[PDB]
């Protein structure tokens, strides 16, 4: 790849999001990547799917990602993959802040201070791990060293 050639994908077509949401909703999915057709589908919990997705494609240009719960950890993986748009059903404040810093196009249904643990009474151990870390690449590296 030429370091002189940069793709700019900054908007998503509103009817593809519409279509992907219909699929996400109809299949109780937890993660979806969509290009006009469905290219990755998962319903597991936590980061396992985002990592599965990361391991599967170098990038997601021309595609959109839908995710149930987007924390800083998932934001980092997704940012590196360069999807056209990420739609988060719930996004945490750290994730939102990060995606703005990176000019990634994204939308959300609910915003929350931070992703929560199994209980719903405290912070997800992965979110706490990466909470005071700045760099998405450093974050991806540390998360992978748990899987
Ligand atoms: Zn280079
Ligand atoms: Zn570039
Ligand atoms: Zn491209
Ligand atoms: Zn939604
Ligand atoms: Zn930063
Ligand atoms: Zn970096």
Automatic annotation (TrEMBL):
Zn(2+) 1 binds at residue 61. The keyword Transport does not apply. The keyword Zinc applies. Zn(2+) 3 binds at residue 101. Zn(2+) 4 binds at residue 135. GO terms for molecular function: catalytic activity; metal ion binding. Keywords: Metal-binding, Zinc. Transmembrane segments: none annotated. Zn(2+) 2 binds at residues 87, 109. This is DUF1893 domain-containing protein. It comes from Thermotoga maritima (strain ATCC 43589 / DSM 3109 / JCM 10099 / NBRC 100826 / MSB8). The lineage of its organism: Bacteria, Thermotogati, Thermotogota, Thermotogae, Thermotogales.
């Amino acid at each position: 790849g030429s370091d002189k050639i940069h793709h700019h994908h900054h908007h998503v077509e509103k009817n593809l999001l519409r279509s992907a949401l219909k699929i996400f909703e109809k299949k109780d999915l937890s993660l979806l990547a969509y290009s006009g057709r469905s290219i990755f589908e998962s319903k597991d919990s936590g980061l396992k799917p985002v990592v599965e997705l990361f391991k599967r494609f170098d990038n997601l240009e021309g595609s959109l990602v839908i995710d149930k719960m987007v924390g800083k950890a998932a934001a980092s993986f997704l940012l590196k993959m360069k999807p056209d748009h990420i739609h988060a059903k719930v996004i945490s404040k750290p994730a939102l802040k990060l995606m703005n810093e990176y000019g990634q196009s994204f939308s959300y249904d609910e915003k929350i201070p931070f992703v929560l643990g199994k209980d719903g009474k405290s912070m997800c151990p992965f979110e706490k791990l990466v909470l005071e870390m700045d760099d998405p690449e450093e974050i991806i590296r540390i998360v992978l060293s748990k899987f």
